[PDB]
Amino acid sequence: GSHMSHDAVRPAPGEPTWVDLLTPDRGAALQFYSALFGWEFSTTSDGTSPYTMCRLRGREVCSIGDLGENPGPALGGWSSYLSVDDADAAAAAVPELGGAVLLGPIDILAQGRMLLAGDPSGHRVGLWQAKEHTGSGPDDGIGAYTRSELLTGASATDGAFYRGLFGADFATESGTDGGGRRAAIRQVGPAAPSGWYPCFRAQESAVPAAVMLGASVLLRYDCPDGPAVVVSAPGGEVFTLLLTD
Numbered sequence: 001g002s003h004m005s006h007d008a009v010r011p012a013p014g015e016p017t018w019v020d021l022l023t024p025d026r027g028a029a030l031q032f033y034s035a036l037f038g039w040e041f042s043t044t045s046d047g048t049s050p051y052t053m054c055r056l057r058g059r060e061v062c063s064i065g066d067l068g069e070n071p072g073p074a075l076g077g078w079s080s081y082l083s084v085d086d087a088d089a090a091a092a093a094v095p096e097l098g099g100a101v102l103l104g105p106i107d108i109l110a111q112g113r114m115l116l117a118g119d120p121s122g123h124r125v126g127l128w129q130a131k132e133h134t135g136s137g138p139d140d141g142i143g144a145y146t147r148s149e150l151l152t153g154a155s156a157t158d159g160a161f162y163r164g165l166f167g168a169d170f171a172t173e174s175g176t177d178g179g180g181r182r183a184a185i186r187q188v189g190p191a192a193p194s195g196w197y198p199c200f201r202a203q204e205s206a207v208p209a210a211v212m213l214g215a216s217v218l219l220r221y222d223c224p225d226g227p228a229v230v231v232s233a234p235g236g237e238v239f240t241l242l243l244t245d
């Protein structure tokens with residue numbers, strides 16, 4: 001009966017949520033994508049759909065998806081999944097800011113909820129509902145996710161979207177949070193690509209690992225961390241590599 005909670009939850013910032021990447025041919029993608037980082041494949045479970053989990057050193061990293069006969073998937077390439085208060089929370093604030101929900105709310109195997117929002121031009125913003133964990137996986141340095149960064153032509157706009165679905169604006173109040181949300185938005189276009197694509201950690205040797213395959217060069221500089229490498233995969237998947245150790 002319109003009661004409020006009496007507990008403030010403050011998750012640990014920095015920890016990424018998740019990152020999935022659809023492909024036309026999972027079999028082939030594993031040959032390209034995994035050739036960049038140098039990961040290993042694993043067998044799928046039986047009884048369920050074919051799911052290849054990409055793990056190494058007994059440490060969780062990422063998973064690959066596929067479409068088969070689905071010409072219009074949900075992912076549409078790399079993207080950053082931001083963790084919201086609730087699937088419905090975010091979706092509910094979408095219209096409050098003046099956006100449009102494209103997908104969700106949906107119940108993926110009653111395990112989680114993924115939905116997309118933004119404008120009807122086809123902008124997909126990864127939104128996951130953190131209930132158990134916020135994607136706190138093993139910190140093996142290299143090979144694990146690094147962070148989430150979106151390159152849009154309207155930092156001021158996207159910022160408004162984030163501050164609304166995540167920022168305090170969501171609940172137009174303070175006290176029942178700390179501020180442990182992860183996101184990043186930069187304004188670029190002429191001198192840098194555009195789209196949703198988190199960063200990843202790899203050795204310097206990974207740079208050419210992609211080149212040799214025939215990756216497309218767009219932008220590999222002008223980053224806050226210094227050395228950056230953004231390549232465009234042949235299928236249309238855009239992602240950024242940062243050299244650290």
Ligand SMILES: Cc1cc(O)cc2c1[C@@H]1O[C@@](C)(Cc3cc4c(c(O)c31)C(=O)c1c(O)cc(O)cc1C4(C)C)O2
Nearest residue numbers: 017018019020063065066067074081106108112114128
């Ligand atoms: C949204 C969606 C809706 C739908 O009707 C069918 C469907 C998907 C999508 O692609 C697949 C192949 C299955 C699938 C699986 C996941 C996600 C996903 O988008 C999709 C997903 O978003 C996600 C995540 O964000 C964090 C996780 O820890 C795990 C996942 C899993 C479960 C791997 O078919």
